[PDB]
């Protein structure tokens, strides 16, 4: 099984978050159990609820109650949660996930694949994409093997963003680093990568960016800089 | 019903981890199925050990020989037992059960610390301002912390050798792959700012040693 996920990652108070999950290799009405879990920021798995394959029955976690649905299209071999009226209690990594129905051999009901995850901030601020920056490396670092450059995220809402370098060819001596919160509510990331200075007469270095919420992506070249 | 597990454990390399699952008393820690899963920060939860006794257990894929499982009865707790304790052994570890339903019953996960990682001093690289975000008038300084343990950190921004308050947010520290920590802060100010002194400093602290990095608004 593949599991893989979408859905918005910015819901507005009260109103409804919806994500879906799409499997291959397993068709979702002939069995297991299709479940979704969420991760609120720096604390543990919280169980939300689950859908049968083959009967459609559904469980919830007794504290999401009515505001939960998980259903199953197979029409399209997916699988759903919609929970309305959110609040921040609901801001949360959110996972689908599956196991192997009861009567199986016990191994199988462990959680066996996962959805990437999909970051879920409860805000009534509107987005804003990052504006990118270029850094230079130092010109006496340039003198020297090595330089570091890099990228600066700033300004953005909400999580995530994606940072690549070179279109993804460029991996080796790749850090990008958590984002800051800003006073402002506002988030801020870097991205730096190490390379032979030799390299900086011969190759581009640009770095992609990444932010789906809103609908941004930019591509910095990093220029080069002797003063 | 509830799983309770210690927020945090240390443990020496090559002895063993013991980490608890106390089940509430309305089940029986004896005939329970017992779920561990491993997580590390930016993946999913991945499944480690399926407990129910010695006689039929199994790992989890890709998990090594040198874990098990064991189960107390009077205390009413399952354990996950991790031998020739590695430093890539460091991470999050959630118990699990099922009840009556197959609804998912978690833990809140306990973080394993594997003692003895040598310490290691910040790589430190401080970034100016762009001449793109100085048209915009305004100027962020980026201070990039890496590879250090243990993962505490004290961060100072001066400029011209005096103390910078104002404009400073340094993130908590954060467990990279290779088990080391990373951190960074960013001093925001204006343009006008920034170019009215002749240098700043992102001063790091790690364990008494400062490493200190410096940018000069001449360029």
């Known amino acids: 099984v593949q599991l893989q996920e979408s859905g918005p990652g910015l819901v507005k108070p009260s109103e409804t978050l919806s994500l879906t999950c799409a499997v291959s290799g397993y068709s979702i009405s002939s069995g297991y159990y299709w479940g979704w879990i969420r991760q609120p920021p720096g604390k543990g798995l919280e169980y939300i609820g689950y859908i049968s394959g083959s009967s459609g029955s559904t469980y919830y976690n007794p504290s999401l109650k009515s505001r939960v649905t998980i259903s199953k299209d197979t029409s399209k071999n997916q699988f759903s949660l919609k929970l309305s009226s959110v609040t921040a209690a609901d801001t949360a990594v959110y996972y689908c996930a599956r196991r192997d129905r009861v009567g199986s051999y016990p191994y199988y009901y462990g959680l066996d694949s996962w959805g990437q995850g999909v970051l879920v901030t409860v805000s009534s601020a509107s987005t804003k994409g990052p504006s990118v920056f270029p850094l230079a490396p130092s010109s006496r670092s340039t003198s020297e093997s090595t330089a570091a450059l890099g990228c600066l995220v700033k300004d953005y809402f909400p999580e995530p963003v994606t940072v690549s370098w070179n279109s993804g060819s460029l991996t080796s001596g790749v850090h990008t680093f958590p984002a800051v919160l800003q006073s402002s509510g506002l988030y801020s990331l870097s991205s730096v990568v190490t390379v032979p200075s030799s390299s900086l007469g011969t190759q581009t270095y640009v770095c992609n960016v990444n932010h789906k919420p809103s609908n941004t992506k930019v591509d910095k070249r990093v220029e080069i800089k002797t003063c | 019903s509830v799983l309770t597990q210690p927020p945090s454990l240390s443990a020496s390399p090559g002895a063993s981890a013991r980490l608890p699952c106390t089940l509430s008393?309305?089940?029986?820690?004896?005939?329970?199925?017992m779920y561990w899963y491993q997580q590390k920060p930016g993946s999913a939860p991945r499944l480690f050990l399926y407990?129910?006794?010695?006689?039929?257990?199994?790992?989890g894929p890709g998990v090594p020989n040198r874990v098990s499982g064991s189960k107390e009865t009077s205390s009413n707790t399952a354990f996950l037992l991790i031998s020739g304790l590695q430093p890539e052994d460091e991470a999050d570890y959630y118990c699990?059960?099922?009840?009556?339903?197959?609804?998912?019953?978690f833990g809140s996960g306990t973080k394993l610390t594997v003692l003895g990682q040598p310490k290691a001093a910040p790589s430190v690289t401080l970034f100016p301002p762009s001449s793109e975000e100085l048209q915009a008038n305004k100027a962020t300084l980026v201070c990039l912390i890496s590879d250090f343990y243990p993962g505490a950190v004290e961060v100072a921004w001066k400029a011209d050798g005096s103390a910078v308050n104002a404009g400073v947010e340094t993130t908590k520290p954060s467990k990279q792959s290779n088990n080391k920590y990373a951190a960074s802060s960013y001093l925001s100010l204006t343009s006008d700012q920034w170019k009215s002194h002749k240098s700043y400093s992102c001063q790091v602290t790690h364990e008494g040693s400062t490493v200190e990095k410096t940018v000069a608004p001449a360029e």
């Open positions: 008393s309305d089940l029986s820690v004896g005939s329970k199925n």
């Open positions: 407990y129910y006794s010695d006689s039929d257990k199994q790992l």
């Open positions: 699990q059960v099922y009840d009556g339903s197959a609804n998912d019953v």
